[PDB]
């Protein structure tokens, strides 16, 4: 999936360079590395009888 | 320390105060109290004099 972003020039009252804003397209492909889940003790529920 | 070091001139090997052991843990702590994010004192610096 591609991601179109664009930059701007601000605060300085801009001249006519032919470019105030830019354009950046970021390509991102998914990668897979092994998962390793671990279990440790946490807070418990009420469980009222 | 250095006071007891200078006390070594006359007698030696009899001093004691403040118990031995401590415990608190078996997996996780409750943590409903003190923090100290910023910590620095003169002693830690290279000024042991």
């Amino acid at each position: 999936f591609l991601l179109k972003y664009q930059i701007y020039g601000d605060i300085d009252r801009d001249p006519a360079f032919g470019e105030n804003t830019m354009t950046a397209e970021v390509p991102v492909v998914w990668d897979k590395c092994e998962v390793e889940v671990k279990l440790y003790a946490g807070p418990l529920q009420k469980l009222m009888s | 320390r250095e006071r007891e070091e200078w006390l070594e001139l006359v007698d030696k090997t009899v001093g004691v105060k403040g118990l031995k052991e401590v415990r608190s843990i078996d997996g996780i702590r409750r943590h409903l109290e003190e923090y100290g994010e910023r910590e620095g004192f003169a002693v830690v610096r290279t000024l042991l004099s």
Partner: protein, 49 residues
């Protein structure tokens, strides 16, 4: 700094004591269950735990 050698301190022995009531606390028991998965209590001790 370097003057005399050895000496040091033998820490004094003292007893330990608690909040005074017969019944067991809910937290310490419920939180003891979070770590282990034993059916009955290994060691065979309830109060000392």
């Amino acid at each position: 700094p370097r003057s005399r050698t050895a000496h040091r301190v033998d820490m004094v022995r003292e007893c330990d004591f608690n909040p005074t009531m017969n019944l067991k606390a809910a937290g310490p028991k419920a939180r003891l269950r979070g770590s282990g998965v034993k059916s009955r209590r290994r060691v065979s001790e309830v109060p000392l735990a």
